[PDB]
Symmetry: C2
Subunit: 555 residues, 2 copies
């Protein structure tokens, strides 16, 4: 739709803004548009662009990073009028990001705005506070956090106390630091212990700690193994963004998604033994780390969602997280339905139709986009057509029991309108509900008939159609359809499967003389067919062929 | 007690298809020379197994070993019965017995004319009836040969007919697939020369065409056969427990080799006329019904082959019947028969035949439940065969003789309790339903069923499926409730929650779903919250949320 016909000249800013509109989740495309506006120093558009990105991906910590970075690089112009409102938004209470790289940014700023020199008291006394919150909110939950612990450390050591009420607090802190770090699974405990030992001597216990340090040192071994191949390579600067280290729409390494679910599973055991708030934290941390690095996996959002709602009340929590998940994957049926389901519970009936509907809109456009970028890939297309229809079916059903039969009609009315773009399952699924009204076959039957308009050649359809006629016992009906399509049904392996069905049906419904004939026609169009193997199918009782499992178990 | 004749006549009554037991009872009456009992015993074997050609052999043999006493009063009526028209046996080992007799009762010396002239006729019928259909026939072709060669013509009207015959012989043999065509040609060449080598060439040319054709047709045969086994004993003393099939036994490998050889034959590579090919077939079919006699498939197929031919509504039935006599407990053959009796409209045997199959299975079950009741699998495997036939019997009688009939039957299945399987209440239920799509009656049935199967998840699962099918909301809640504890296993109970949950969804509420869903994950912690979320959203027995999005 856009791109095609919306043909601009040859001004990057226009095709990009067009391609982005077609793939609003391709993070890289925005990165290119930014790179461009920054090179033309059109700073106003840089923020419009960063904001559309923040709007859609609130918890993509690294995108906030790329942004704070951009400012910091203006040297002496670390403008607190631009900088603070950003941090303020991305470090908030709800869509509050908790990632180390971003905190290391938060710190750098706090350190450039409170000079240890001319500030004195609250100066070096605020930087400490800033280093502490990063320690409580995230440093103690991240095993690959060493780099930070060092940062905080060096700032405490390289500090000369002016008197003695300081000389003291400096060790009071240098202690509370070391102790804190040494009790968590980390990539540098071994060395960091060797350091604290020596430290304590040349200053004036270690037995107590020694315990949790051991426990830690090895809990980091299990970690290191569960992780093993964990990839965490998102760019945190604009220039480091490469097509290769940002996910393309709907992309994501399964291997990775599995390593993450695994780490999360481990965490949920609570091997550390933390209180209920400290463990709820430690998981929430890991969960947001995963939603950042495999953001396009609908299962990580699905799971994080339920983990946060599994907690306490507030009917809004579960919906909050699916919503964010749907924003990263606008085309996910997993997420659409999960939302659709929550809206129904907190009873907001209007959004139920809204959300599902969008997912369809997104899929519609994805289908269209492929039918044109390479219409020769008839599988990838049917795969989509299938997904389109599947969603329609779930929609129709869901509308039918939420807003009367007349609703379902509306929907199916328009699926028809789509023709061959949809798949047979919509008429079958419509049929089966158009029936269940008042067990009547008058209306319900007229449906599939229509369908025959586009699918009288899909043995796949016909089969499922007979299965219905047979199901809702309508004898004549079967004979009719069977007849009409023995030539018109492509394939063979599927037509065969269709004969056996109607023959088995004939048998159950009297005659045996009728059977005797269909049986003749069958073997003519299918010479070579094993007379006795097909004999057994005619006598399956309860979908099971016992003749074969008991006597001819060699068949 | 401890008198062989009694335990044997007992065991035999328990396994009337165990051919070895009759052979023992016979070895016994023979060593006591109670000849009148030997015949009664042989005849019971003949009654049940008409075409076990090799049993007629053991019996003719027995007589021939009474030396001078080749009593044509005993012998002839035997041959006459086992070489007749309908149950006429066509096996080469039996014909070699028939010739042996015909040679002892028509001496070449004192008979002269019709003497060696009747012996030839006998050799000739063995040639037209079977010798030319059997490729491992070499042994016979030799016999006939030596009898023609070792014959010096008294004059010249003989000198001639002798080579007229030795010709007609060699010609006939070299034209069919055989285990010694190579050597038999080498022989026929030299023969034509030392008889008129002025035309050894101009003749041998013609034959040389089909001789080749055969020499290679025998090569395919030899390949398809390769591992064929044909070792039945043809004398009473060669019968060992190991070379006679135990009741219902039969190498599958063998049955396949036979069906294969029969397919080959049906292609008609030989190019024979329509009666000559129909014979060649019938020969091989009878060979197969002798060596894998307890395989219902061979009898089944032989049967339809002989019917597929022309008219005579009784042909297919004749053969199914002999096969059922070999395997009284065959559901395949009982229904095949039951079906035939129905076409030739003799409704009364429809019930008879199915019923005996049942009797035999009942007896089979009983006997296993006793000889080794620890083998609970082999037991249920049977209780399932018992019930399966009952169901088919019940359905069959339902449309053949009214609903009241199905009742009678199911009424006696109940009488059986746990000896039968759950499928009978399910099957009865689905019919008791289809009367007038009413659920009052059809439902009271499965309830009964609950008496013995309230613990079989397998049953409860299938029960629900029905409740759901014939949409009866509450009913599903009730059953679901009542058995979440009483249902053994887990893998089955889990499958049961899912089902009832997917049902709850389809039938409004979603707040009800919300709850069941809760109880589910409690009794089943560890269950993948998202995997079970997809199942609830299947559309047409298919979980697309999984095949399309979460396809890993």
């Amino acid at each position: 739709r856009p791109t095609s016909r919306v043909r601009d000249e040859s001004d990057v800013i226009g095709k990009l803004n067009d391609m982005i509109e077609e793939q609003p989740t391709d993070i890289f495309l925005y990165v290119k548009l930014l790179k461009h506006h920054v090179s033309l120093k059109q700073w106003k558009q840089v923020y419009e662009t960063f904001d559309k990105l923040h709007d859609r991906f609130p918890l993509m910590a690294n995108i906030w990073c790329m942004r704070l970075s951009l400012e910091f690089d203006k040297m002496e112009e670390l403008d607190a009028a631009v900088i603070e409102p950003v941090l303020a938004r991305c470090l908030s209470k709800e869509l509050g990001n908790n990632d180390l790289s971003l905190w290391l940014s938060y710190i750098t700023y706090v350190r450039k705005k409170n000079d240890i020199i001319t500030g004195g008291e609250e100066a070096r006394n605020i930087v400490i506070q800033a280093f502490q919150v990063v320690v409580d909110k995230c440093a103690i939950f991240e095993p690959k956090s060493i780099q930070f612990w060092n940062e905080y450390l060096h700032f405490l050591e390289h500090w000369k106390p002016v008197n003695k009420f300081e000389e003291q607090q400096r060790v009071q802190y240098i202690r509370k630091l070391y102790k804190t770090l040494l009790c968590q699974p980390m990539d540098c405990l071994e060395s960091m212990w060797q350091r604290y030992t020596q430290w304590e001597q040349d200053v004036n216990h270690i037995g107590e700690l020694s315990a949790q340090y051991m426990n830690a040192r090895s809990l980091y071994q299990d970690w290191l193994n569960i992780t093993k191949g964990l990839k965490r390579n998102l760019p945190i600067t604009l220039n480091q963004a490469t097509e290769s280290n940002l996910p393309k729409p709907n992309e994501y390494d399964v291997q990775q998604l599995l390593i993450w679910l695994e780490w999360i599973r481990w965490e949920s055991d609570n091997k550390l033994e933390l209180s209920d708030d400290l463990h709820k934290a430690r998981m929430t941390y890991v969960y947001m780390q995963a939603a950042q690095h495999v953001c396009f996996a609908p299962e990580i959002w699905f799971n994080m969602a339920n983990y946060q709602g599994e907690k306490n009340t507030d009917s809004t929590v579960i919906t909050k997280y699916l919503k964010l998940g749907q924003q990263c994957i606008p085309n996910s049926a997993v997420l659409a339905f999960s939302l659709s389901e929550q809206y129904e519970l907190n009873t907001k009936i209007p959004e139920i139709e809204t959300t599902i509907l969008s997912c369809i809109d997104r899929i519609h456009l994805d289908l269209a986009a492929l039918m044109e970028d390479d219409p020769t890939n008839e599988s990838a297309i049917n795969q989509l057509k299938s997904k389109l229809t599947y969603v329609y079916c779930v929609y129709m059903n869901t509308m039918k029991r939420i807003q009367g039969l007349a609703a379902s009609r509306k929907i199916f009315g328009k699926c028809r309108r789509l023709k061959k773009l949809v798949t047979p399952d919509i008429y079958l699924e419509n049929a089966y509900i158009e029936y269940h009204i008042s067990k009547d076959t008058k209306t319900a039957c007229k449906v599939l008939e229509l369908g025959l308009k586009y699918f009288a050649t899909d043995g796949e359809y016909i089969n499922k159609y007979l299965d219905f006629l047979i199901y809702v016992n309508e004898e004549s009906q079967v004979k009719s359809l069977f007849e009409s399509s023995i030539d018109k049904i492509s394939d063979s392996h599927l037509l065969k499967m269709i004969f056996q069905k109607v023959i088995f049906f004939e048998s159950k419904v009297g005659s045996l003389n009728s059977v005797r004939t269909l049986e003749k026609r069958f073997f003519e169009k299918f010479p070579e067919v094993n007379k006795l193997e097909e004999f057994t199918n005619k006598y399956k009782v309860l979908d099971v062929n016992y003749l074969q499992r008991l006597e001819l178990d060699y068949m």
